[PDB]
Amino acid sequence: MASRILLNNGAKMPILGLGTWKSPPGQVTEAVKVAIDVGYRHIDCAHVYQNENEVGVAIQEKLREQVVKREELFIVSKLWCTYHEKGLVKGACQKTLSDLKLDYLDLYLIHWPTGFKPGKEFFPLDESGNVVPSDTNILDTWAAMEELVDEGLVKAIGISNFNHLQVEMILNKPGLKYKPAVNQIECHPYLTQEKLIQYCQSKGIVVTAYSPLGSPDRPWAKPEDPSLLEDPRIKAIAAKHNKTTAQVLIRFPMQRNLVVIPKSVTPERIAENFKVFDFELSSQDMTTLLSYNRNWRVCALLSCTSHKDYPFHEEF
Ligand SMILES: NC(=O)c1ccc[n+]([C@@H]2O[C@H](COP(=O)([O-])OP(=O)(O)OC[C@H]3O[C@@H](n4cnc5c(N)ncnc54)[C@H](OP(=O)(O)O)[C@@H]3O)[C@@H](O)[C@H]2O)c1
């Protein structure tokens, strides 16, 4: 298992990164410091997470300490839905750069294909409770992303939560200048994503798997829902390999040529989650894990199903 995957912009991306959604602002600085100390070189961020300043404090301190050099880090962030207008994209990127206290991002993603009305609210609502869309299309937002590469603000651009028709729409864009480097999508044994992964990989787009542990801290979790970390079938594979269930869940996407971004703010788990370069799942283990697919999503953007660009009505 090599530590980095080559992107279609010519740069290498670490296959294991630290997620930061829901990492409390008073804990995430130490989490990122610990992560860098124990080997992580890739941090997955987003403006909508509201903690980029605190992530940035950690990055800056570890650079100052010379634990790592900037060239060795791979920092990812994402353009929120209220910034899809072409004229808002640069400033959104620059706010993230300023908060993360970086001069460039390694990768900047369109967070979702759905654009929303700009303004202070991340989910602007009409009086009837619906999320108000923007009229800016997926292709115009991509052209604005391309400009960021040409201005030196970002080394790579990509997409997130795009279905294959939406990926295809970008690939088929008239005058396309840069292909997406990455599509970051939810992926785990209950949402195995075979069709969309194969499509993206066939086009040279690297896939990053989010919520690889099934996001047991997601805000909308119910009692009722399936639980990867507690699934006896997965626990048995882990026991066979003398690893934790989380370590199996992280190794699984790695062996599919995916990047994976487990989140933790717990120092012991941050270290555990990195210790996934010391064992191999068999092909039979891999097929067995794939067999658990349920089409179950942590992140279904349920408030936005009427949006024209909602991604999850299409089969993939
Ligand atoms: N592009 C998108 O739209 C999108 C959407 C969702 C997620 N993401 C990205 O993907 C990252 C990961 O997904 P996620 O945050 O939804 O969930 P996740 O990584 O699947 O699960 C995180 C949860 O698992 C716990 N955990 C971590 N390591 C563990 C271990 N070894 N043993 C037991 N429990 C463990 C964490 O607890 P503690 O933190 O308390 O240790 C936290 O409650 C996000 O943080 C974000 O960076 C992106």
From Swiss-Prot:
Substrate binds at H111. Its EC number is 1.1.1.21, 1.1.1.300, 1.1.1.372, 1.1.1.54. GO terms for molecular function: aldose reductase (NADPH) activity; all-trans-retinol dehydrogenase (NADP+) activity; allyl-alcohol dehydrogenase activity; electron transfer activity; glyceraldehyde oxidoreductase activity; glycerol dehydrogenase (NADP+) activity; L-glucuronate reductase activity; prostaglandin H2 endoperoxidase reductase activity. InterPro entries: AKR, Aldo/ket_reductase_CS, NADP_OxRdtase_dom, NADP_OxRdtase_dom_sf. The modification N6-acetyllysine is found at K95, K222, K263. The keyword DNA-binding does not apply. The record marks K78 as: Lowers pKa of active site Tyr. Highly expressed in embryonic epithelial cells (EUE) in response to osmotic stress. Keywords: Acetylation, Cytoplasm, Lipid metabolism, NADP, Oxidoreductase, Phosphoprotein. Changing Y49F: Complete loss of glyceraldehyde oxidoreductase activity. It catalyses: an alditol + NADP(+) = an aldose + NADPH + H(+); all-trans-retinol + NADP(+) = all-trans-retinal + NADPH + H(+); 9-cis-retinol + NADP(+) = 9-cis-retinal + NADPH + H(+); 13-cis-retinol + NADP(+) = 13-cis-retinal + NADPH + H(+). The modification N-acetylalanine is found at A2. The active site is at Y49 (proton donor). It comes from the Eukaryota. Cys-299 may regulate the kinetic and inhibition properties of the enzyme, but does not participate in catalysis. Tolrestat inhibits retinal reduction. One of its GO terms (cellular component) is extracellular exosome. The modification Phosphoserine is found at S3. CDD domains: AKR_AKR1B1-19. NADP(+) binds at residues 10-19, 211-273. One of its GO terms (biological process) is renal water homeostasis. It is found in: Cytoplasm. Monomer. Belongs to the aldo/keto reductase family. Catalyzes the NADPH-dependent reduction of a wide variety of carbonyl-containing compounds to their corresponding alcohols. Displays enzymatic activity towards endogenous metabolites such as aromatic and aliphatic aldehydes, ketones, monosacharides, bile acids and xenobiotics substrates. Key enzyme in the polyol pathway, catalyzes reduction of glucose to sorbitol during hyperglycemia. Reduces steroids and their derivatives and prostaglandins. Displays low enzymatic activity toward all-trans-retinal, 9-cis-retinal, and 13-cis-retinal. This is Aldo-keto reductase family 1 member B1. It comes from Homo sapiens (Human). The lineage of its organism: Eukaryota, Metazoa, Chordata, Craniata, Vertebrata.
